[PDB]
Design a protein around this ligand. Sequence first.
Ligand SMILES: C=CC1=C(C)/C(=C/c2[nH]c(/C=C3N=C(/C=C4\NC(=O)C(C)=C4C=C)C(C)=C\3CCC(=O)O)c(CCC(=O)O)c2C)NC1=O
Length: 209
Amino acid sequence: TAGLAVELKQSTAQAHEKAEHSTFMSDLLKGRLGVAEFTRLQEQAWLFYTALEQAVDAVRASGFAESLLDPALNRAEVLARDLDKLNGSSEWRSRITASPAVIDYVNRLEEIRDNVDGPALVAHHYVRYLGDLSGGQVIARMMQRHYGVDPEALGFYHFEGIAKLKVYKDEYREKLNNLELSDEQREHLLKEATDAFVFNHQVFADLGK
Ligand SMILES: C=CC1=C(C)/C(=C/c2[nH]c(/C=C3N=C(/C=C4\NC(=O)C(C)=C4C=C)C(C)=C\3CCC(=O)O)c(CCC(=O)O)c2C)NC1=O
């Protein structure tokens, strides 16, 4: 009754809370881990953001949700640069492999990409990017504070090209509210958003293992 942004927040609350409270992310943010574990996180993130951004490109090209799917949000190329700094060479590209959790997540993104499934893609976009815009400074700050990570290796969290960030998040939520969705597409979107948090929790679980 209060618009899609509010409903997404409320519908995904249980899954979001489960993901935010994983042991791996909890130890990472409290300073118990190290730049190594942060680097492993960012390597798995590079795999699933590469897949997410293929799916966003296909959806944007179909004409669905275009103003929401701002290409300034793309993280994959920035993440690779970060991983070039963190690993000290481009060695990582040919070494990293998807964890099982990341295989399932990437598979789902690739299904969404090739189905060109606009409402599913919007769900995954909200769960990753709005997250990144919202709590991302807190993650970048803890990485600098606990681990000494250089801010030039935290480009993923900087969002180059956005000046006023609170404004941008506000407009992102209004763009969600303004999306034209059938009841069926809206249900599909809400369910996919919860699945997105579930995938992310399992990514942190596999990292912890
Ligand atoms: C898989 C984990 C995870 C993801 C994907 C995630 C996404 C995510 N984090 C959000 C907010 C937020 N997220 C954080 C914080 C964090 N977020 C973090 O991942 C970490 C590690 C912190 C550090 C405490 C804060 C402080 C907000 C503010 C809430 C808001 O603006 O609504 C939102 C905003 C929802 C909305 O405004 O309706 C999303 C989608 N949050 C998660 O926890």
